[PDB]
Ligand binder design. Structure first.
Ligand SMILES: O=C(O)c1sccc1-n1c(Cl)ccc1Cl
Ligand SMILES: O=C(O)c1sccc1-n1c(Cl)ccc1Cl
Ligand SMILES: O=C(O)c1sccc1-n1c(Cl)ccc1Cl
Ligand SMILES: O=C(O)c1sccc1-n1c(Cl)ccc1Cl
Lengths: 145, 145
């Protein structure tokens, strides 16, 4: 709902780790293939996200993701708080993650490296379209705000 | 001028390479520390950029940056053309690059890793403010378009 809310999770594919951020209000995605799930990678991703968009709160489906000193420090520096208004469903964000994995599978054979296929899939997801695309919606929501 | 125009260049610091993209109309920046200057890294950066913003043309101060088959293929896939309306000055974009290096130097001792300091500097640059910030201007320009 609020335009400052993002959700971050990781997904595994081909023995690699995909960090997926979803802007909750728009469905817009940013993603990165990272070598392993570590607090350092999560912290770095959060700082990059925060320099690009007005990130006020962040949610996740795996709370332990956010416990390291390194993540907390990135939080702290960028003024990011943890989001507590989205309950855990033992999910809309998890569906978009499954959609993204669907798109990855559909484009995977067109790229040599998984990391390329992920960015192809993000591009497809954000530009696909009343009826606007997620990329159009995020800029509208933020500009209006 | 046109909202689809970006400029990409590399900068060197501490034996590492910083790839800097500037949205020409707004002054908004995205940057990444990459291990070396290669066409693969440039291509990957361009795909990520293109999935996030409506990238129509790209300029650079080092034309040889864009000759590899890998960059051309990323171009091709994302529908990016080379920008030919910005002449080379043997520069506004080069000033912002120097501004960013100024900010990096000012925050460098607050982070262990250069890559963190770069993202701190991008955050500072994009959020600093009539009088709007570059981050505010890019979303306004794109939303209006
Ligand atoms: O580089 C640092 O000193 C800081 S300061 C706050 C987070 C980090 N960090 C990131 Cl981001 C990745 C690895 C580290 Cl350490
Ligand atoms: O192609 C589809 O059926 C759907 S459905 C939602 C996204 C996409 N998509 C893929 Cl996968 C590649 C290009 C597009 Cl558009
Ligand atoms: O992964 C690929 O097959 C393609 S397809 C077009 C560019 C690339 N690429 C990137 Cl992006 C980084 C390294 C490579 Cl290869
Ligand atoms: O601090 C300044 O003089 C300027 S001047 C332009 C940006 C900045 N800046 C830095 Cl460097 C850290 C925080 C800010 Cl704001």
């Amino acid at each position: 709902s609020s335009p400052g809310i993002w959700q971050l999770d990781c997904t595994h594919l081909e023995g690699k780790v995909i960090l997926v951020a979803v802007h909750v209000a728009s469905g817009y995605i940013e993603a990165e293939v990272i070598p392993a799930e570590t607090g350092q990678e999560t912290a770095y991703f959060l700082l990059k996200l925060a320099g690009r968009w007005p990130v006020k709160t962040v949610h996740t489906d795996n709370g332990s993701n956010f416990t390291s000193t390194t993540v907390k420090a990135a939080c702290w520096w960028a003024g990011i708080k943890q989001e507590f208004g989205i309950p855990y469903n033992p999910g809309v964000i998890e569906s978009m993650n499954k959609e993204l994995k669907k798109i990855i599978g559909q484009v995977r054979d067109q790229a040599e490296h998984l990391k390329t296929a992920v960015q192809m899939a993000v591009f497809i997801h954000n530009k696909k379209r009343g009826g606007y695309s997620a990329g159009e919606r995020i800029v509208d929501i933020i500009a209006t705000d």
